[PDB]
């Protein structure tokens, strides 16, 4: 029994320094912010990038961090709203005896997260995805050591590989989200997989009322779409399926008893047969129209769960009754 | 302009005494396969044969050789009362003409239209016919004989899977599917030869179904294939939407979201404005609690989407014409 | 009713001063594969890159980023006179509206329709647009508010890849689809049952460039499709068993002369006993003449002389629904 | 060098006896002949009349009670009662004189029975394969007829059992007494003689009853043979209609005008009085282009 993961979006604001740069990005291209039709997506894609960097940390922009000499200070935290929440969260996660994996889209943010963990004295490992194979093996094993010195693991979402195991941690923090919903999903399942004994909790830093909240909904819409496409994974399989042995038999046997029982004629031809009056014909038409709507509505509201023909339905064993 | 939705009505029909005799003969002459089975390899050829003969029985016994009363052979009233579907059709047509309606009659078997031809002449019904062997010049002349203003014809006999489609026969308002195609889109294709843009009246489609026989069970399997066909259409639509990259309109809404509140903000934003200083774990407990509330709320908007209500771009309905040509 | 056949006219267009520079630049950045005077091993994927960019160059240079003078991107007269096809389009549209005609403009690239959108606003052309990215609600609303009497719209921009736009009479294929049948669907949005006037289709082709060679190879595919269509007719007709009408004409053939006959028949009435080898030499002589004559009747048949029952042409719409 | 075969339709009439039995067939089902039945009727009733007329065209003795009553003898009446037998009698006489050997094909083995009684009556050595003869038996039949210095002269064959790939090139003349509905069946019967190993000109005689059902049978068969060779010669069409652009095809697309573009150093040639001069010059090239390719055939494409 693997305990299901608790995914929580934590909604964070921006410091004054972020707002200043966030405005500068919006200002220096206010025409595109207001929005010719010829131009490629590049002009808008750049603004999206700079707004996402600003939602991570203003120090990612050159000439933002306080002037020389550059010092690792408390303002490394207080100039980024996420770092504030991250500061108290880490101090409380280490308190409750939990270990945390911290992911991010930008490696240049992990550079800040390296300097932050030194300022607070947190032991950590790191995988950039520019780190070699024998290197990232050691970083995984150092964190997975029984009684590991490390406490935080900094990684970039895509670049860790596939199927790596970090079950020695039980908390996952997504500093920022990927455009692809499964990329973060594969990052949560680094701690939420077979071998994990404790409750996996995933925190997703989302800058409220900014671009990242709008980014999240798009990734939420595409994630639901993938679910709709997987849940209907046998629609094309069920449509092409030709006549089945157990179906072909029920087609032939349907009503065979009444056919064998009949000595005269059948339903319409026994009840009123060979001669119909329009009082008689209208009773047929109106009844058939009634049956037509019920037959449609009963099948119209169906789903793939009911329509699906499992592979064992082909393995006709015997007749239920002869 | 307004095109009235088509009324599709299953007309459940019984069988005459003669149909029962042959239907029994078909079941009896191969009773070992019906009551039991054979090797899976064997039975599919053996069962598909029984299915095909039973469908011939539901249409008309005279499709079997030696069925119609022995020599001499005359076209009389026995052509009608020996087939359940003919009896229903005979009075249905009589009502159809009196209400000023003209009817297209489709069928899977061309030899049945041969039976209907002899019936139409027997009643004095002017008719045309499209066999899929008719020839273009003959085809154009027969459609124009039936469609051209002030036409004399009343019944139009066609085979379902021989249209060569793109035909206009809007002068009829009633469509009779004497029997149904295994592929539902073929019968729906035949309906859209009268129920097409240019049609002005209410299209009524009568689908003959031999009740308590093989045709009724086929009717259900067609409704299943018709519904899951909608799912492939719908699953494909979600597949296109999931693969679609960000639009310039989508990107603009992403940048503009909250931009006005940012321009309006002179200090800090949100959680930083509300406390700012690294403060109490009661404030952090409020942050994580309210965020989890919005997480449950966010999922609820999207967890109720479902396959059947995605945004349409192409009006693809498996309950309407596919657009293909079955010849 | 009478539906006037569509007039399909290739309008061969040159290239602007700017286009030539980029067309050279495309060929120059991959000059080894173009020349073919070396290994000739160069992969087709490398060639498919040249073809696709040369089409963008044939369409409009501004499809390449950094070509158009830098930001802010403003719509002026340089939007027209930097592309050969736009110059032809600019005066063609002016003539089309003045003669009371409305035009559908199709294209393979939606980013070109975006260029056409900025052009249409620049000239004051009321328009609608179907990209295959517009919602059904708006598309059904766009077709109606284009067809309604007293419409203000004049141009309808669509991507090539059962819709009715018969209220327009002119179709412009700015660029061509590799599958000729895809263009015919785009044509049959005005040229269909419901059209009252003569449908004229203009196919823009960049003369003396890649678009001209595609036109020659597209005509082959369009002709080969006709031959396949015809082979199917000959295949089905050969597979057909005799009808009851065909068999009766075989039974009835000469039956009147047989009933008319009171003694022996034909050649047997001529002699009927063991007579001269002049009789057999005469039979074989007339038979060999009739044998040659019979072969001539069928030696003059061949493809394209086959009976139609279904009027399917490669030069007419398939009925297939085309989406990119 | 294999000489192309000569195929000559021998149009033949019917004896007085054939005229009677032809009329007896048409009259005993004259309602079907005059088309006085329902369209729903099965095809069997018409096909019955067809085979009866086919049997009458071959030989009247195929019908019961036709040959002169008791006593039953094999004389010249076996020949002068059938129009084809009269022609076949004189034609074999000429063939044997000029040193040729002949295969005789037929649809009906009950007619090969008649031809057997004919060959014995005329003194012609012969072999026979029916489709009722087993493998080893019909092997020895081939070897005897192909034997160097063969004793035989005629080979009576059913059109069914001939087309198997066997060799009968030691006969240079083929006589199809009656034609098959399938043009390739008779076509492969001629190839029993007309194939590698044949040294002489192969001549094929196709007996046809003129102004009777067999002439109309011949026309329809000649039609379906014409349909056959059309689909054969146009089999190269569907394989080329769907084919990705070959690497050397794409090269000509890229090279088209590349020489004109490089040396240009300016704007191209083109770059409402000018516009109507473009549409007019383009309309000329469109009509010429389509007319050049529309009449083309598979060999060019």
């Amino acid at each position: 029994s693997l305990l299901p993961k608790k995914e929580i979006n934590v909604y964070i604001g921006m410091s004054e320094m972020q707002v200043k740069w966030y405005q500068k990005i919006l200002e220096k291209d206010i025409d595109a912010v207001n929005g010719g039709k010829r131009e490629s997506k590049t002009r808008l894609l750049n603004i999206v990038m700079q707004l996402r960097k600003c939602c991570n940390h203003p120090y990612l922009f050159e000439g933002a961090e306080p002037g020389p000499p550059y010092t690792t200070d408390e303002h490394l935290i207080y100039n980024a709203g996420k770092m504030v929440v991250l500061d108290k969260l880490l101090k409380r996660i280490q308190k409750q005896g939990s270990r945390v994996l911290i992911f991010s889209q930008m490696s240049r943010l992990l550079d800040i997260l390296e300097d932050y963990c030194v300022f607070r004295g947190y032991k950590y490992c790191r995988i950039d995805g520019s780190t070699a194979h024998e290197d990232r093996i050691a970083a995984i094993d150092e964190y997975n050591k029984p009684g590991s010195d490390k406490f935080i693991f900094l990684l970039t979402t895509r670049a860790g590989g596939l199927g790596i195991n970090l079950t020695t941690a039980d908390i996952v923090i997504l500093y920022d989200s990927d455009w692809n919903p499964q990329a973060d999903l594969q990052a949560m399942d680094r701690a939420h997989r077979i071998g994990q004994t404790k409750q996996v909790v995933v925190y997703r830093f989302v800058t409220d009322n900014a671009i990242e909240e709008k980014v999240l909904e798009r990734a939420a819409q595409k994630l639901r779409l993938d679910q709709l496409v997987i849940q209907q994974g046998r629609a094309q399989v069920a449509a092409k399926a030709a006549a089945n042995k157990d179906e072909l038999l029920s087609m032939i046997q349907h009503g065979a008893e009444k056919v064998f029982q009949t000595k005269g004629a059948f339903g319409t031809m026994a009840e009123k047969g060979s001669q119909l009056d329009d009082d008689d014909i209208d009773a047929i038409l109106q009844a058939g129209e009634t049956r037509t709507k019920e037959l449609n509505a009963r099948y119209e509201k169906l789903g793939i769960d009911d329509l699906q023909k499992f592979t064992s339905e082909s393995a006709y064993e015997w007749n239920g009754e002869d």
Side-chain angles (χ1 to χ4, degrees), chain A residues 83-111:
Chain A
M83 293 296 302
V84 173
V85 176
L86 176 65
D87 186 30
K88 182 59 183 181
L89 197 61
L90 287 171
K91 205 174 308 173
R92 174 177 156 184
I93 282 175
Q94 194 181 30
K95 196 76 163 301
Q96 66 186 37
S98 302
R99 300 219 297 167
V100 52
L101 314 169
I102 300 183
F103 296 97
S104 173
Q105 295 293 126
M106 309 176 186
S107 62
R108 277 179 41 82
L109 178 100
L110 298 198
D111 296 339

Side-chain angles (χ1 to χ4, degrees), chain A residues 29 98 103 162 164 169 190 204 214 298:
Chain A
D29 205 334
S98 302
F103 296 97
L162 179 63
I164 85 173
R190 313 252 170 172
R204 181 187 298 269
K214 204 62 180 177
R298 204 205 327 172

Side-chain angles (χ1 to χ4, degrees), chain A residues 177-216:
Chain A
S177 294
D178 193 278
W179 52 265
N180 164 44
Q182 200 191 16
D184 295 336
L185 231 59
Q186 296 169 286
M188 303 179 188
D189 290 343
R190 313 252 170 172
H192 176 264
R193 60 184 304 174
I194 291 184
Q196 178 65 262
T197 62
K198 300 203 299 180
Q199 174 72 77
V200 177
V201 177
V202 181
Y203 297 102
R204 181 187 298 269
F205 292 163
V206 179
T207 303
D208 204 336
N209 280 324
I211 184 180
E212 277 187 332
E213 181 193 8
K214 204 62 180 177
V215 168
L216 178 59

Side-chain angles (χ1 to χ4, degrees), chain A residues 46-65:
Chain A
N46 191 31
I47 307 174
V48 171
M49 170 70 53
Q50 309 302 328
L51 286 187
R52 291 200 311 107
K53 299 174 58 183
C54 189
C55 289
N56 278 347
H57 204 296
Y59 291 5
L60 298 171
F61 306 108
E62 187 182 5
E65 176 174 7

Side-chain angles (χ1 to χ4, degrees), chain A residues 35-286:
Chain A
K37 285 202 163 65
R38 305 180 287 270
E39 26 199 316
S40 57
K41 296 173 182 173
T42 306
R43 181 145 166 256
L44 292 184
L45 282 183
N46 191 31
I47 307 174
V48 171
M49 170 70 53
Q50 309 302 328
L51 286 187
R52 291 200 311 107
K53 299 174 58 183
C54 189
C55 289
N56 278 347
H57 204 296
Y59 291 5
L60 298 171
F61 306 108
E62 187 182 5
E65 176 174 7
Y70 307 140
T71 65
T72 62
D73 50 40
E74 294 282 349
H75 282 340
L76 181 64
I77 306 173
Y78 296 113
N79 288 129
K82 292 182 180 177
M83 293 296 302
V84 173
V85 176
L86 176 65
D87 186 30
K88 182 59 183 181
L89 197 61
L90 287 171
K91 205 174 308 173
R92 174 177 156 184
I93 282 175
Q94 194 181 30
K95 196 76 163 301
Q96 66 186 37
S98 302
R99 300 219 297 167
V100 52
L101 314 169
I102 300 183
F103 296 97
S104 173
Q105 295 293 126
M106 309 176 186
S107 62
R108 277 179 41 82
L109 178 100
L110 298 198
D111 296 339
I112 295 182
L113 295 191
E114 261 205 298
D115 303 340
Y116 162 82
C117 291
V118 174
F119 176 85
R120 299 285 169 172
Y122 293 135
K123 312 293 174 58
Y124 64 92
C125 291
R126 177 169 173 174
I127 293 180
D128 307 323
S130 308
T131 47
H133 183 18
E134 297 189 354
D135 284 13
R136 66 175 180 267
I137 286 185
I140 291 303
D141 296 338
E142 261 292 327
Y143 202 91
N144 290 331
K145 276 171 184 177
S148 171
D149 176 40
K150 309 304 181 301
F151 161 62
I152 300 179
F153 208 152
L154 298 177
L155 303 96
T156 54
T157 317
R158 312 298 202 98
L162 179 63
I164 85 173
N165 209 272
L166 289 173
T167 48
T168 62
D170 64 284
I171 298 183
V172 175
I173 299 183
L174 306 180
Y175 199 98
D176 53 335
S177 294
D178 193 278
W179 52 265
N180 164 44
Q182 200 191 16
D184 295 336
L185 231 59
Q186 296 169 286
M188 303 179 188
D189 290 343
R190 313 252 170 172
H192 176 264
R193 60 184 304 174
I194 291 184
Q196 178 65 262
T197 62
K198 300 203 299 180
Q199 174 72 77
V200 177
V201 177
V202 181
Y203 297 102
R204 181 187 298 269
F205 292 163
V206 179
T207 303
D208 204 336
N209 280 324
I211 184 180
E212 277 187 332
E213 181 193 8
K214 204 62 180 177
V215 168
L216 178 59
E217 300 180 10
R218 308 289 176 172
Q221 290 182 354
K222 287 215 176 73
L223 181 62
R224 178 59 188 176
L225 273 27
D226 299 334
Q227 298 174 318
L228 289 170
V229 176
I230 298 322
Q231 189 162 349
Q232 310 273 321
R234 306 185 299 289
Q236 306 203 28
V237 176
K240 303 174 183 174
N244 189 10
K245 173 65 173 57
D246 200 17
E247 301 175 338
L248 268 175
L249 219 56
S250 65
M251 289 170 50
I252 298 178
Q253 296 179 349
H254 181 91
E257 176 202 348
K258 277 156 290 303
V259 175
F260 288 155
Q261 177 67 24
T262 292
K263 302 181 180 182
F266 233 52
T268 305
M269 310 288 294
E271 289 149 14
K272 306 285 179 184
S274 71
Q275 279 98 37
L276 305 177
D277 59 292
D278 57 20
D279 212 34
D280 191 51
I281 196 66
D282 293 340
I284 300 173
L285 293 180
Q286 192 60 32

